[PDB]
Amino acid sequence: MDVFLMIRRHKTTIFTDAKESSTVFELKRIVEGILKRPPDEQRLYKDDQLLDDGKTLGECGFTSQTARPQAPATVGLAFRADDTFEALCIEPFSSPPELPDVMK
Amino acid sequence: VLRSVNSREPSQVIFCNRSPRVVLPVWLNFDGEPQPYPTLPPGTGRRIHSYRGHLWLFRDAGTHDGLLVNQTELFVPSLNVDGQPIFANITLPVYTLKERCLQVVRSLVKPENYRRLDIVRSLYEDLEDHPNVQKDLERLT
Amino acid sequence: MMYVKLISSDGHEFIVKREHALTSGTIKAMLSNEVNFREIPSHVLSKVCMYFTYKVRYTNSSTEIPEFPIAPEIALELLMAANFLDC
Ligand SMILES: Cc1ncsc1-c1ccc(CNC(=O)[C@@H]2C[C@@H](O)CN2C(=O)[C@@H](NC(=O)CO)C(C)(C)C)cc1
Known part of the structure; x- marks a missing residue:
């Protein structure tokens, strides 16, 4: 089963899918292909939880019925600069304006 | 042009609303005038009596947004095989x-x-x- | 897979499959691998990308199609973007 994801770090957001059966490490290989950083320089997160390389996306709670094409699940991403890892930082999207009066 | 053929040959049909909308079925009468039929709530079905060669389309009853039936615009009941009804899947x-x-x-x-x-x-x-x-x-x- | 980068007015960089971005004829024109959108903020462009995923997934598919969700607060801006992008 496909799961649909947003892999997010700072102001970067990757839209992609993966198999529920696929592993965290395999997702780092996907990120590697796109952002040119190897898996050993990546940490992936679900909310605040650091994800283990060997676990499946399904095991980590990314399921086909929660990680949907029209509402994808978020996977946090952090890079290691040299010796140590940055902290997980995901920049929020902008805030919508107030509804015009005629829409209230 | 677009009108039901007056065949008088019964054809039993299941209108199956697999949309989240309230569905308005519309029969195109023999003069091509759209005749509205009773609505279907989301996810519900009705077994109805129609006729071979008759033309139907389906709309959101509240807004008249377009819907598909068996993946297309128009549904025409056909000959029932083995007494089985024709399925009209509305999505x-x-x-x-x-x-x-x-x-x-x-x-x-x-x-x-x-x-x-x-x-x-x-x-x-x-x-x-x-x-x-x-x-x-x-x-x- | 070929990806492209779509950048919102507030600097959010959205990386999506090239094939998905070509849902928009406007985006296709702007490419001929990054496009900047000076008028589309991230709360709108993120939804645009989700639409691409939704469209590609459910186009020519028999599995029942869910409603594409749009919050009231973003609908007007999303409309404007959709009209620009022709999608
Ligand atoms: C209960 C319901 N919910 C949503 S639609 C519906 C419903 C209710 C009554 C019917 C009864 N069937 C008809 O009215 C069919 C449908 C269409 O094929 C035209 N029709 C006729 O019976 C027509 N009859 C013939 O063509 C006789 O040859 C007349 C009477 C409207 C002219 C069908 C669907």
Whole structure:
């Protein structure tokens, strides 16, 4: 089963899918292909939880019925600069304006 | 042009609403006039008696947004095989993002106020030009 | 897979499959691998990308199609973007 994801770090957001059966490490290989950083320089997160390389996306709670094409699940991403890892930082999207009066 | 054939040959059909909308079935009568039929709530079904060669289309009953039936615009009951009814699976299309936005905006703004929206004239006209069966019949002709 | 980068007015960089971005004829024109959108903020462009995923997934598919969700607060801006992008 496909799961649909947003892999997010700072102001970067990757839209992609993966198999529920696929592993965290395999997702780092996907990120590697796109952002040119190897898996050993990546940490992936679900909310605040650091994800283990060997676990499946399904095991980590990314399921086909929660990680949907029209509402994808978020996977946090952090890079290691040299010796140590940055902290997980995901920049929020902008805030919508107030509804015009005629829409209230 | 688009009208039911007056065949008088019964054909039993299941209208199956697999959309999240309230569905208005519309029969095109022998003069091509759209006749509205009772509505189907989301996810419900009705076993109905129709006829071979008759033409049907299906709409959101509240907004008249277009819906698909067996993946297309028009449904024509055919010969029943082994006494089995014909299934008419009614679903949402994949609307364009523009049409879907027009739907949501229409649902929140009264038509008198479309002109008060801060958008280009063509979008005000797009909002005002809401879905309508007659418009589609002319299109489909 | 070929990806492209779509950048919102507030500097959010959205990386999506090239094939998905070509849902928009406007985006296709702007490419001929990054496009900047000076008028589309991230709360709108993120939804645009989700639409691409939704459209590609459910176009020519028999599995029942869910409603594409759009919050009231973003609908007007999303409409404007959709009209620009022709999608
Ligand atoms: C209960 C219901 N919910 C949603 S639609 C519906 C419903 C209700 C009654 C019917 C009864 N069937 C008809 O009215 C069929 C449908 C269409 O094929 C036209 N029709 C006729 O019976 C027509 N008859 C013939 O063509 C006789 O040859 C007349 C009477 C409307 C002219 C069908 C569906």
